[PDB]
Subunit: 176 residues, 8 copies
């Protein structure tokens, strides 16, 4: 009897929502804290999200001896996407401090990654800047380790990123 079709639909429907409420609860997020000990003032340009979003303003100014705090997180709902993108600040020397972060949904296939680079001139973050920092500029793993690196322009980085979905990226930018 078609009585069994109605229950099939019922079970089928309870499966569906269990699965959607599950994927809904997977959280991927990133706290970013960058310490400006560069000797110059940074002014915010933008954050290009390749994946996910943010709920806050990107701090506009950041003086010598101050820290910038920003964060983001994957899109709400049962999507299987993470939080991935690039933060671009212009510096008072005319150049751009850029910072990559990647906190993926599917840890089977992907890992956490980060990067820091100083591009020449004012460059807003975008799909190209992300592709460069992610695929072609020796990005660091979110491997629970500290990594130092010279940036040019009389500057060096030193940064840490943990390996979980509740990611934090701490970076210090000092005079090399």
């Amino acid at each position: 009897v078609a009585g069994a079709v109605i229950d099939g639909a019922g079970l089928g429907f309870d499966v569906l929502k269990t699965v959607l409420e599950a994927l809904g609860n997977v959280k991927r997020k990133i706290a970013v804290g960058i310490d400006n000990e560069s000797g110059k003032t940074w002014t915010a340009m933008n954050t290009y999200f390749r994946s996910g979003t943010s709920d806050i303003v990107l701090p506009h100014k950041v003086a010598h001896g101050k820290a910038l705090l920003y964060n983001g997180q994957k899109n709400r709902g049962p999507v299987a996407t993470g939080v991935v993108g690039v933060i671009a600040y212009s510096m008072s020397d005319g150049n751009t401090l850029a910072v990559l972060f990647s906190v993926p949904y599917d840890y089977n296939w992907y890992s956490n990654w980060w990067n820091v680079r100083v591009y020449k001139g004012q460059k807003r973050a975008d799909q190209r800047m992300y592709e460069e920092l992610y695929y072609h500029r020796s990005p660091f793993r979110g491997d629970n380790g500290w990594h130092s690196r010279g940036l040019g322009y009389g500057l060096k980085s030193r940064g840490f990123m943990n390996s979980s979905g509740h990611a934090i990226l701490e970076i210090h930018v000092t005079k090399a």
Copy 2:
């Protein structure tokens, strides 16, 4: 037997409310903060909502060196509408400061957008003003970036809007 119609209705009813309680939980909202460093006093006229509503008063006065805070949100219930509209303030020079915001329900088809314009004279916001600022005056994306722009009348804007359903729009209006 019509026994299976009664269960079909039952399942059909539980589907319905699951879907309505879902759409009921989608939140779209906007916090707006505008900093008046324009040298003149602004007096509120109104907010035209193309979509959604607000639960608070639109601050009547805003002096030099003060900030205006307003907000809104989509209509209550299981509608698939967002929060979209224009805020109009009259300025003590005889002109209108207008500000667009768009925070749509369906991010598949739409994005966050904002705009700032200075119209000549007292102009209340309405469907026409919205259509202009949205479709025909190079509105900025809610792209997690800062965007500067001269307004005429010895004034410039500089504003930020994030990309999510929990939108904020921060704008500073300064003497160009």
Copy 3:
């Protein structure tokens, strides 16, 4: 078998209460704040509710330079009624300050409205005073806009009312 009648009744009963608990949760309410800068003292008369009720006392006195706060809300339970009515204050010049508010249940068919008028003499609010202010005296929409209006008797109004079910009506009464 009459087994299906028992379930029909069951489903039919669960429909009913879902719908009644829903209509039960729809809230319509109004916060009213009127600022007396009229130069005279107001003394309360009454509030005629065309729809809904209040849970508090209508403030008896309101001096020069003070504000009156009152509120109301629709009737409890699964009724489809709103909150609608008129507040009447006598003023020390012998006349009545009257104030309309309308926050309807069914926004398909209706909108928020308000009005402010100065009637000559002591006039308690009632169905007639409401019908006048609502249908025949150019009432303002709850349209998220400020609206000024001279009242006669050396007085002007300037008021705001938002467009939602969680309505507020802010009105300032100053010496014209």
Copy 4:
């Protein structure tokens, strides 16, 4: 099969308790505040409840320039009764201040009402005193309005009562 009788009973039983838990949640109550500016001391006699009860002591003394606070509420459980009765205070001039309140269960058939009277001598409240103040002495409606009235004995009343099930009755008793 008598299987359908067992479910009929089941549904029938779930109907019953839904209805009883509903009527159980209807609250009818009254907060009473009377301000003694009569020049004399009041001493409490009693409160005759025609309907409902109270959970507190009726304040025994109330001097010149002090206020009395009392309250009550309908009977607990799924009864369809309200809170209705008369409060009697003896006054130091030898007479009784009496105060009626009525907050009914079924607002289809009834409204809120109140009254204030000064009876000669010591008179405890009771069914007769209630019937007088309710049916035969021009009681005021709980109509969200202020109502003044001379009491004799060099005294006047001025009182307010809202229209809802969460009733309050505020009364001031001053020298006439």
Copy 5:
């Protein structure tokens, strides 16, 4: 099929516990506060509960100008009994102050009652003392009224008891 007996038992069992959890929630209790302004010191003897119990110690001493606080409540569980009994204090003049309270379960058949008497000598409370004070010594109703009464021995009472299941009994004992 005996399948319907198993469901009959099931329904029958859910009826039972609904009813037992209901009767379990009926609370009957009594707070007692007696003010000793008798000029003598009272020393506690005991409380005879005709119905119900207490969870606290009966205060042993109570000086001139102090108050005694005690309370009780009906027996835990789905019994249909109330809280009813007599409190006996010996007084420093050699006599006993006795106090009745009755807060019944079934308000259809019974009411709240109280009494105060001064017996000659040391008399512990018991079934006889209760029967006297309840049936044969003009006990006062828990009628939301104050009642004064001379006690002999240069003493008078003046006491109040409300009419609900959440009873309080306030009594003042002063020098007549």
Copy 6:
């Protein structure tokens, strides 16, 4: 069909746990407070529980002019046992202060009881000491009354115990 055995088991199982969760919630406990005004120091020996247990240490010392606080409660789980036993303290005169308490599970068949005795020498509490104090030494009822009694050895008791399952036993031991 054995289908009805599976449901019989099911119902039978839901009966069982309802009954076990009920008996699990019955609490029987005792707070004990003994005031040492005996002129000597008491040192704890032990508590023999005939029924139930404790979760705390039996205070080791108790000087002149100090009070001892101990408590216990029935065994965890759906047992139908109470909390019943004897507390033995050695006193600095070479003798034992012993104290009985009984707070039974089944108030149909049993009541609360207590006792105080002074035994000669060091005697730990045990089944015999309990049997003596319970069955053969005129123990006091937990009857919501104070009871005085000479103990010998220049000492008297005066103690109170309420009648409920949430028992407290307050005893004062003073120089006769």
Copy 7:
């Protein structure tokens, strides 16, 4: 029909988890507090758990006139094991203070026990030391009694352990 096998499995599965969630909730734990008034400093070696575990560090030092606090508890999950073991501290005289505790799961078959011994030299606790203190060295019962005992080496113990699953063991070690 195999329909009854599916329900048999269902019931069978609900039995299983009810029983596993039950055994999961049985808690067995032990708080240990030992007061060092031995004249020497103790240094921790280890705790051998015959059954269960701990979640904290075993305090390393414990001076003259200080107390050591440690605790443990049975293993998480639906096991039927308790918390049982031996604590070994080295003392500044070259010897070991050892302390047994046993808080079993199944009180049908077992009781609480404790012991205190001073072994010559540094001896870590282990299965042998436990077997000695438990089976062969006259261990004290967790019987809600104080028990004194000379330890040799110019030292005596005096300890208490209650009889419940929420065990505490208080021991004082003083100069004999």
Copy 8:
């Protein structure tokens, strides 16, 4: 009838999620606290997790006389993995302080373990360093005992680790 397949699936599905929510609740974690009394400054390199992750930054600096606090935990979700890995700090003498921890999921097959070693030069932790410290360098058990060990380079360790899934590892590093 295929009705029994639909229920089989249903039961089968409820089994599955009960089991997944269970494994989801098993927590394995580690708090690590290391006290630097080595006379030199440590600088963090990294933490290699063989199993699990962390949610925090590995403290970068740790001076003489200060303590480092870090922690981690197994991966979120119904995996049967623990938290296992090695922490590597460079020391101001040019060498690496390394610290192993192992807190496994399946206590049937595995135990808690820890280790401390001083490697020559800067060596980041990794799979090899873990395999050495775990399999080949006499690691200590998480056995609720203190264990001392000379490290070379004028340094010794002394550390404690408990035996449970809520592991802590406390280690002191002092001058040898």
